[PDB]
C-alpha cells in the first residue's frame, strides 16, 4: 500500500529471457501453423469464431516495439495462440496436436526460466 513495498524482483532481464523464448518456440518443428496470421479472407469460420488472432510473429512484432508492458502480458498472447488453436482444431489433426505439443514446450520453457 501507499509508502510499503513488498522486495523488488528483478525483471531487467525478461526482455531478453522472453525473447530466447520466442526464439525456441520460432524454431520448433511444430511452430509451422503458427508462425504466421492465419488468413481471415482464406480459411472460413476463422474470423467471425477466433475474437482474437494471435500468432509467434505478431507476438515478435509486439516484443521488438515496447507493445509488453510485464512478460504475464508476454505469456498471456502466446497462450492465445494455443487456446485459440484448440478452439479450431481437433485435437485428433496435425494443427491440434501442433497445438499441444507446443503448449507442452512453452510452459516448461516458462516454469524453468522464471518460477
Given at each position: 500500500?501507499?509508502?510499503?513495498?513488498?522486495?523488488?524482483?528483478?525483471?531487467?532481464?525478461?526482455?531478453?529471457?522472453?525473447?530466447?523464448?520466442?526464439?525456441?518456440?520460432?524454431?520448433?518443428?511444430?511452430?509451422?501453423?503458427?508462425?504466421?496470421?492465419?488468413?481471415?479472407?482464406?480459411?472460413?469460420?476463422y474470423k467471425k469464431v477466433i475474437?482474437?488472432?494471435?500468432?509467434?510473429?505478431?507476438?515478435?512484432?509486439?516484443?521488438?516495439?515496447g507493445q509488453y508492458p510485464n512478460?504475464?502480458?508476454?505469456?498471456?498472447?502466446?497462450?492465445?495462440?494455443?487456446?485459440?488453436?484448440?478452439?479450431?482444431?481437433?485435437?485428433?489433426?496435425?494443427?491440434?496436436?501442433?497445438?499441444?505439443?507446443?503448449?507442452?514446450?512453452?510452459?516448461?520453457?516458462?516454469?524453468?526460466?522464471?518460477?
Amino acid at each position: 500500500s501507499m509508502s510499503v513495498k513488498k522486495p523488488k524482483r528483478d525483471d531487467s532481464k525478461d526482455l531478453a529471457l522472453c525473447s530466447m523464448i520466442l526464439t525456441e518456440m520460432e524454431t520448433h518443428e511444430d511452430a509451422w501453423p503458427f508462425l504466421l496470421p492465419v488468413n481471415l479472407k482464406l480459411v472460413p469460420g476463422y474470423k467471425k469464431v477466433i475474437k482474437k488472432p494471435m500468432d509467434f510473429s505478431t507476438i515478435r512484432e509486439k516484443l521488438s516495439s515496447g507493445q509488453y508492458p510485464n512478460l504475464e502480458t508476454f505469456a498471456l498472447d502466446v497462450r492465445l495462440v494455443f487456446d485459440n488453436c484448440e478452439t479450431f482444431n481437433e485435437d485428433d489433426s496435425d494443427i491440434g496436436r501442433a497445438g499441444h505439443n507446443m503448449r507442452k514446450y512453452f510452459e516448461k520453457k516458462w516454469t524453468d526460466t522464471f518460477k
